Amino acid sequence: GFQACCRGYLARKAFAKRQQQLTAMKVLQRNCAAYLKLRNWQWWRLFTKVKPLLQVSRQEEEMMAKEEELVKVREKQLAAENRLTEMETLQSQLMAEK
Amino acid sequence: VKPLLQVSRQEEEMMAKEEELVKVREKQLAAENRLTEMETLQSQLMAEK
Amino acid sequence: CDFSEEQTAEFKEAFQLFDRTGDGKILYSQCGDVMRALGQNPTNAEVMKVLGNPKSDEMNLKTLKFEQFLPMMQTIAKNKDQGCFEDYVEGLRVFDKEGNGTVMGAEIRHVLVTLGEKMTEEEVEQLVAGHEDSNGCINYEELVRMVLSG
Amino acid sequence: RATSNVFAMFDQSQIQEFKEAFNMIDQNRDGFIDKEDLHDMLASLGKNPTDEYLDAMMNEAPGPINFTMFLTMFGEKLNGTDPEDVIRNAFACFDEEATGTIQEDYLRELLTTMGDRFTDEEVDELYREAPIDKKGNFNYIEFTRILKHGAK
Amino acid sequence: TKKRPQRATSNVFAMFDQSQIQEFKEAFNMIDQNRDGFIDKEDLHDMLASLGKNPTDEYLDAMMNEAPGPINFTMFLTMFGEKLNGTDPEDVIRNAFACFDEEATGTIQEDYLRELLTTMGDRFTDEEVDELYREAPIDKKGNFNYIEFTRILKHGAK
Ligand SMILES: [Mg+2]
Ligand SMILES: [Mg+2]
């Protein structure tokens, strides 16, 4: 009687994974469907060469990322010095102990 | 005109973030080597104890 | 049929998700998967009974439709031999030695593989997965509570 | 087609990039694209080639291509596609271990056993102009960039 | 005939990085008063009046003669690329100076640079070296790595 619930739980869980997986494959094949006719578009390959020249990202994402990354790297760099100072004391303490 | 540029002024200033990040990253990378060096010395000295 | 059309529409939509069957059909072996995914908790014996006691080779040389699958689910929902979780939580206590609401995972795996209708090693592992602890024990109460919500 | 506001189709960043591109691809900026500007751009980009076959596509749109018509013809062909982040998130469904590569035969089987069944020819056409390792391994993490034609 | 011909048809990516083109576009965005990619005479006139204390009239005529007409982003970029043809990046000269300096740093001395440009075996005259000396920073000798020179030349340590 309990094995039925365990077997059904797997079928229901596996069915849920297939439901979301089926919808995910739709976006994959759909994105690839239009890409076929779009791949051979003379206006696409020509325009893609201009996108690197525009760079719509600008400092809106670079400044925010660099500013947020600098804080994380700053604390990480300072954190390394903290661990280094702690290890220096242990290394120096062990030297005096040894 | 390059020294001014109201928009490019942020670009040069934005480069300071990458420069400061790269500079801070250099200290972090060097700190990692020093951190591992102390670990080897601390472990080596601890092994002698 | 004693079954509303509201839930019947959702049942048809769920059954149409398989697709991989040539057309609006369903295989004999895959019938249990679709019968257990929509709801209920039929057993292997119940599945073989409602299916008319199919032969060993008949489980891979024939396919059914939805007109025949609907009455199967109807009978499984109406006529059933399952039970509430109060009896399941009390059944797993037979293996509890100390009696602190915990049981070894290996014992549960062995009981599921041997005792009962038997289960493959690929299913028992996924069933016992997630409830790992330091002492290797799995609380039967939490296991049953999680299986009931599935 | 579904006629509607051409601005509501593309996203803010997308429409901004399209406008910035239209403002750039123009030797004589004036809200009117002609064959001369396209020919000059092609000559400057490909080292002075001359493809007289591209002029046979102007008849598809009503007269010369305008920025409005340009956005319209971009949206009529880019329908169904989505950004790269969502594409990577959807690709992350398979594999599970997240190795960044999937077998080519497995991808072909997936593209012909659920949803819109893609013929073998359509699946093979996606490999007639791109690299591939001898050990299979469809570098999806790297193929996401080539999908947008961000090379060559 | 406002639309100019193909005029040579020089590429805009012979050996230039995306950062250079981005900086050039950002600069053109400020000069063009009409904000449409048409650097007219009035645009450069106002630019010079604001920066270099107004031109000498003939500057605008010379700039117009040196251009095929209403200069724009693409035309200006192509002209500057053709003018920069043959110039190598700054990293190349930086590495060359670093590997040539015997001090393992990359410095350059005035007295040593004189011999390197003259007695080494070149066609450098007195004025050729005097111009380089005048173009140097506040110091006429490179007592530091070859970085400040490239910075003041390109206005960007990158
Ligand atoms: Mg035009
Ligand atoms: Mg203008």
Curated annotation (Swiss-Prot), chain B:
Modified residues (N6-acetyllysine): 27
Post-translational modification: ISGylated.
UniProt subcellular location: Cytoplasm, Cytoskeleton; Cytoplasm, Cell cortex; Cytoplasmic vesicle, Secretory vesicle, Cortical granule; Cell membrane
Membrane-crossing segments per the record: none
Expressed in which tissues: In the kidney, expressed in the glomeruli. Also expressed in leukocytes.
Residue positions where N6-succinyllysine is found in the record: 17
Disease: Macrothrombocytopenia and granulocyte inclusions with or without nephritis or sensorineural hearing loss: An autosomal dominant disorder characterized by thrombocytopenia, giant platelets and Dohle body-like inclusions in peripheral blood leukocytes with variable ultrastructural appearance. Some affected individuals lack leukocyte inclusion bodies on classic staining of peripheral blood smears. Alport syndrome-like features of nephritis, hearing loss, and eye abnormalities are present in some patients. Deafness, autosomal dominant, 17: A form of deafness characterized by progressive high frequency hearing impairment and cochleosaccular degeneration.
Domains: entry comment: The rodlike tail sequence is highly repetitive, showing cycles of a 28-residue repeat pattern composed of 4 heptapeptides, characteristic for alpha-helical coiled coils.
Family assignment from sequence similarity: Belongs to the TRAFAC class myosin-kinesin ATPase superfamily. Myosin family.
Protein's name in the database: Myosin-9
Curated annotation (Swiss-Prot), chain C:
Gene Ontology biological-process annotations: actomyosin structure organization; myofibril assembly
Modified residues (N-acetylcysteine): 1
Key words of the record: Acetylation, Motor protein, Muscle protein, Myosin, Repeat
GO cellular component: actomyosin; cytosol; muscle myosin complex; myosin II complex; myosin II filament
InterPro entries hit by this protein: CALM/Myosin/TropC-like, EF-hand-dom_pair, EF_hand_dom
Record keyword Acetylation present: yes
CDD domains the UniProt entry points to: EFh
PROSITE patterns in the cross-refs: EF_HAND_2
Ranges for domain EF-hand: 6-41, 83-118, 118-150
Xref: SUPFAM superfamilies: EF-hand
Highest taxon, organism lineage: Eukaryota
Subunit relationships: Myosin is a hexamer of 2 heavy chains and 4 light chains.
Record function comment: Regulatory light chain of myosin. Does not bind calcium.
Name of the protein described by the UniProt record: Myosin light polypeptide 6
Organism the protein comes from: Gallus gallus (Chicken)
Gene transcribed to yield this protein: MYL6
UniProtKB/Swiss-Prot annotation, chain D:
Its job: Myosin regulatory subunit that plays an important role in regulation of both smooth muscle and nonmuscle cell contractile activity via its phosphorylation. Implicated in cytokinesis, receptor capping, and cell locomotion. In myoblasts, may regulate PIEZO1-dependent cortical actomyosin assembly involved in myotube formation.
Protein localization: Cytoplasm, Cytoskeleton; Cytoplasm, Cell cortex
GO CC entries: actomyosin; cell cortex; cytoplasm; myosin II complex; myosin II filament
Modified residues (Phosphothreonine): 3
Quaternary organization: Myosin is a hexamer of 2 heavy chains and 4 light chains: interacts with myosin heavy chain MYO19. Interacts with LUZP1; the interaction results in inhibition of phosphorylation of MYL9 by DAPK3.
PTM per Swiss-Prot/TrEMBL: Phosphorylation increases the actin-activated myosin ATPase activity and thereby regulates the contractile activity. It is required to generate the driving force in the migration of the cells but not necessary for localization of myosin-2 at the leading edge. Phosphorylation is required for myotube formation. Phosphorylated by DAPK3; DAPK3-mediated phosphorylation is inhibited by LUZP1.
Pfam families tied to this protein: EF-hand_11 (PF08976), EF-hand_7 (PF13499)
Species for this entry: Bos taurus (Bovine)
Keyword set, alphabetical order: Acetylation, Calcium, Cytoplasm, Cytoskeleton, Metal-binding, Motor protein, Muscle protein, Myosin, Phosphoprotein, Repeat
Protein known as: Myosin regulatory light polypeptide 9
From Swiss-Prot, chain E:
Main subcellular localisation: cytoplasm
Subcellular location: Cytoplasm, Cytoskeleton; Cytoplasm, Cell cortex
Domain of life: Eukaryota
Upper classification of the organism: Eukaryota, Metazoa, Chordata, Craniata, Vertebrata
Assembly notes: Myosin is a hexamer of 2 heavy chains and 4 light chains: interacts with myosin heavy chain MYO19. Interacts with LUZP1; the interaction results in inhibition of phosphorylation of MYL9 by DAPK3.
Modified residues (Phosphoserine): 10
Family matches, as InterPro entries: EF-hand-dom_pair, EF_Hand_1_Ca_BS, EF_hand_DJBP, EF_hand_dom, Myosin_RLC
Organism of origin: Bos taurus
Domain EF-hand: 19-54, 88-123, 124-158
GO biological processes: actomyosin structure organization
Modified residues (Phosphothreonine): 9
Protein's name according to its UniProt entry: Myosin regulatory light polypeptide 9
